[PDB]
Assembly symmetry: C4
Homo-oligomer: 175 residues x 4
């Protein structure tokens, strides 16, 4: 009931859950980035994405695992990042993340148990509570950590998404 991965051992329950995943949902801030928003004196805004996560996302997409993003902010740079990686299911300016989640379930003809969610803060928990595989990144808010099925060894924006992508592909044979 416990299997070796290149990040350390995971339980067979987590691995069984990962095998059923058809949709991976991600936060942006704190998951794809480290949480920082860079702001300038005339409208300049930057975010830092991890390139190893991008390969993870590319691999998932070419391996029949849809990737969606549900974020509370609206930013063209996020639209650019998604468009460069081939992510189409982008949801911006979402206060209540449950709406987009239900939308995704219907559009993909998919059940909550076929969904994985990678989050870092308590606003993600209403959705995380419902999905097949809930994941907190290593440096998520302290109260979210014990609530997840799986906690990543790698921090948000440092390869946390790559780790999850690696896990899904290992569980589904496709690695």
């Amino acid at each position: 009931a416990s299997l070796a991965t290149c990040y350390g051992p995971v339980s067979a329950d987590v691995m069984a859950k990962a095998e059923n995943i058809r949709l991976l949902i991600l936060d942006v801030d704190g998951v794809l980035s480290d949480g920082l928003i860079y702001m300038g004196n005339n409208g300049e805004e930057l975010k830092a994405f991890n390139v190893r996560d991008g390969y993870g996302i590319r691999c998932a997409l070419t391996s029949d695992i849809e990737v969606a993003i549900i974020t509370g902010r609206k930013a063209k740079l996020v639209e650019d990042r998604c468009a460069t990686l081939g992510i189409t299911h982008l949801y911006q300016g979402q206060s209540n993340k449950l709406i987009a989640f239900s939308d995704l379930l219907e559009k993909l003809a998919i059940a909550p148990e076929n969904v994985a969610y990678v989050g870092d803060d308590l606003i993600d928990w209403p959705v995380m509570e419902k999905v097949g595989l809930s994941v907190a990144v290593a440096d998520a808010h302290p109260l979210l950590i014990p609530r997840a099925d799986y906690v990543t060894r790698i921090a948000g924006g440092r390869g946390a998404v790559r780790e999850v992508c690696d896990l899904l592909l290992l569980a589904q044979g496709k690695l």
Copy 2:
């Protein structure tokens, strides 16, 4: 005599001080930001803010805790940040922080004991000496750390403000 929080145990005295807080005063550099200034050849000036802190701030503002910012310089990026966060008490170009402190206290009909202040350097101290709850961020200057009522576990720009918000709400039964 001490209580559990999600960041670690705190003393009863710190909790008793946090229960009484009606105003949270924050610095920009080293508290909301990572303490760095990102400068370019086009004259760009960027500061990095953390997504973890803003959720905390919005929760505080909706839970009858006013949030103010007192800062020594004048920057549009700081104006832009407050607008986004819902902060209407912004004091820029403040050499003498006690002036802003007195203004705040008369403007909100509040006593010094109802005020919390999060700082990171020695310039913060004259105000911190007056407040009900003085807070130093984890990576504050070594000489400020021992003077503060509370030292956060999280460093500036990494969610230290969130920690303080989490603390105040917990103490006031709104976490």
Copy 3:
């Protein structure tokens, strides 16, 4: 046998491989860079390089070791980075790293055993497997690390390239 370096002891086999190196091939992402891509709302893209790496590369170039870059996509910033350091052998937009590798060896009339390659992800392996000295940076993908002849103590974008330059120069009596 083993030998002291300023980063820690190295095996005589690694030192022996480093003695024959006439060409150092470097990745951009996660090797020369911190592995991040900084993106902006109005189309900005930035990558962070490290000053410790630059001095090493120029020492290498002036000490009979060519330095080359093979990379996935075309970017002005990387072109600019190569001009500053004096790297003339730059392959951009290379989907197949093996083709660039072949052209590189034929252009410089060098045998694969006289080549070192520094990587951070699994895509680098096909080329790293053919060279005389394979190097993985300290924070490379966990599956790449055990395969490499040498794993740097220093993380990509923090002086890992300098560490490798220092090794090659040490092995050849030039540090």
Copy 4:
């Protein structure tokens, strides 16, 4: 044998620090963490620490001159100097001894009256000559054993503030 807020320092380091009339700083890896942000439009950024700034401002208002000798050339460094009130700036310096010499004559001081905070081997020719040589915590490995003092704080994280704090303590400020 002497306590500071960053930890114990030797009386020897403190004596050297008492005599300092000029603090020379590297930019890359001392005032910043060594990273150079470069973009597709030719943007170049660097990250400075604000706490270092206050330290620098205290040094200048406390009869200690502050100078910058750097191998790179950038307007952003000029901008940072103007903010801090640093007037002695030497950019594009392949050989740091030439700027060093210039400072000695302009300020009418001796090498023993100088402190140098460095991060890499290029700094050693100058560091070898000064009264107080300083390596930042995360400087090049070979540089560290050579300096009179090694900071607890890493470059771009407050190492300069620590040196300024040390100089002011030694000179009774």
